[PDB]
Every structure is written in C-alpha cells, then in structure tokens.
Amino acid sequence: GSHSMRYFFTSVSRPGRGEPRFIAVGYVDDTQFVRFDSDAASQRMEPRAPWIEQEGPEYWDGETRKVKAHSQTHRVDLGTLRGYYNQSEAGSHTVQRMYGCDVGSDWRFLRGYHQYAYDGKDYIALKEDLRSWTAADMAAQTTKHKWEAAHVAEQLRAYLEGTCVEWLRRYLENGKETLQRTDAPKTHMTHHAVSDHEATLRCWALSFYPAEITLTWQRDGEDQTQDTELVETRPAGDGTFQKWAAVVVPSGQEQRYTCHVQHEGLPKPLTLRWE
C-alpha cells in the first residue's frame, strides 16, 4: 500500500536561437497531476488530474513561481555543464532532474530521492541516507564539493521528509476515489494458428492500475520462457495500462499451458488456460 510523489524535469538547449525548451510533470504513483511546458501559452503550472483542480489560486501562483525558478536553474546548469565538459556552444544538450518521496504501507516517510542527469547519463544523485552524494565523474565531483559546502543535502532532506510527504498525503486523500483504488487487470486469451501444426496463445491484461504487473507462462505446471514473448507495459491513454505475453505451442496441446497474472489489484494471482 506504499505511494509516491515524483517530479520530472527536462531542459534542452537550443543553440540556434532562444532559451532551452523546459518541460516539468508531476506524478502521484502512476497518475500525472500537473505540468509546465515552456512552449505553452499559459506560462503557468497546469492541472492534469481532476483532484488537483481543488487547489486554490495561491497554490497555482506558488507552483508557477517555483517551477519557473526551476527552469532558470536548469538554463544556468546547461551553461555550467557545457563548460565543465568543455563542449562547443553549437550543440544541443539535455539536463534532467527527478525528485520526490515515498510513503510506506504505514503511510509514513519511506524514502526520498533527488537525482540529476546530463545527456542521458547519471550526473549526481542524493544517496538514500539523504546526507551524502553520488557523483559519477569529475564534473559531478565539483558539483558535489559545492553542494556539501552549501549544505544542500540538509535542505533537501527537510523537504523530502516533511513537506513532500505532507503534500503527498494531502493529494492521496483529495483524489482518493482514483488514487487509492486499484483497477485489477481485465484478462483474456486469444488463439492464432501460425501453421498447420503450431499456434500462438496470447494472454492479455487490460485496463489495470497501477502499472506494476507480472505475466508468466507455465507448461504442465512449470515456468516456461522459451518460445515466449512479452511486450513492455504500455499506457492505454485513459490512465490505465496494458500488457500481453504470448507463447507458441503445438496445435492440440493448448491445454498444457497456463498464463499467470500477479497484480496488486488481485487478492490472489489469476490463472488462465485456453478453452
């Protein structure tokens, strides 16, 4: 019954003209609830879930102010990193940041996160103790030295263990109808003859929430990975997710195979077998 709140930020420099493209999104578990896109007309943090619309003007003015300060920090960062890595000013580069907190089943603080990447690779990250930093290279090492002297970890820890968790709990309550509801996968199996002597059984899991799920095939009661294929979990677009796993079997032997589905929304895992 654990939950999380996470913010993702992406800034891409545009050397040909103007400022970096900046996009921020906020999520509670697998539900996006706010966003900011520097290319949008509003220039304001905007709602992406019904339950956040409950917040008043002071909330939106504050989040907008803060998210714009975030974008300027990234803008400066892109410049700083370009120097650290001694890179040309003509190329486009990317800085990403993600932070947030998790509450355990006890609804108490479980852990906090605060990490950064440059051009798609780890740059610097706050360790789990929220007191030390993991720097991936020497550019990141200089950042680490600066943040230790400025005591940045202490400041983040205060937010992650306090404010972060307090708001996560507030959002969970306000949007409890959806956020505290699990949607069990709706499952079924399809049959497709691939030849005169072989067929493909495909096991479907649709409209589930949260995204975490496990689909496994067994043949005569034992796990089988050969002759199988499982697609990456994908968004249905209405807030739920989909996934499927398939296996090729000898025509006529379909009955030996069973699809097993594990999901938080299922009191007990489901077992499917072809008709």
């Binding site: 989040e63 803060k66 975030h70 700083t80 990193l81 600066k146 400041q155 937010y159 404010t163 972060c164």
Partner: peptide, 9 residues
C-alpha cells in the same frame, strides 16, 4: 508541491 529552493550545479 514543488521544492522551494534550487541550487545550481
């Protein structure tokens, strides 16, 4: 709710 202060790299 977003963090309040953002330190530069």
């Amino acid at each position: 709710s977003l963090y309040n202060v953002v330190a530069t790299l």
